[PDB]
Write a protein that binds this DNA or RNA. Structure first.
Length: 75
DNA sequence: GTGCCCACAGGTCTACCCTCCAATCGCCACTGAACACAGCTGGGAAAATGCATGGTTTAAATAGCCCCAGCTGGAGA
């Protein structure tokens, strides 16, 4: 993957925060091939679709959106 | 060898838990009040005792009256 795809999706995320999830599972290849890409580690098993669905629920996303909208209105 | 990133450590702030203090309620102990029972006093009722005007016998000074009772004369056998 590329880092600025994630920086386009989450632009409020700073340094450490946005790349602490790239710290694990990914490694910054910059030499020869795959240069300036974050390749997936060969020992890392990418989680299946049901595990990724079990990570975050849509209702948690709605609760987070309610929190940040109320944060804006109060601010 | 200078900008810039990630990781680890430290500090601060928030949350939860435990401890202490205060307040309230309940129970027990003591005090006060009320009710009930007993005793003493006072009043009323009943019973018992102390009554009073009649009588009484003792004459006698009288006198009318009245039953009876002798009793003696008269009559009959």
């Amino acid at each position: 993957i590329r880092m600025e795809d994630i920086k386009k999706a989450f632009p409020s995320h700073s340094e450490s925060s946005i790349r602490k999830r790239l710290k694990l599972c990914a490694d910054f290849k910059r030499t020869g091939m795959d240069s300036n890409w974050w390749v997936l580690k060969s020992d890392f098993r990418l989680p299946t679709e049901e595990e990724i669905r079990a990570m975050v629920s849509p209702e948690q996303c709605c609760a987070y959106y309610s929190m940040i909208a109320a944060e804006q209105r109060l601010k």
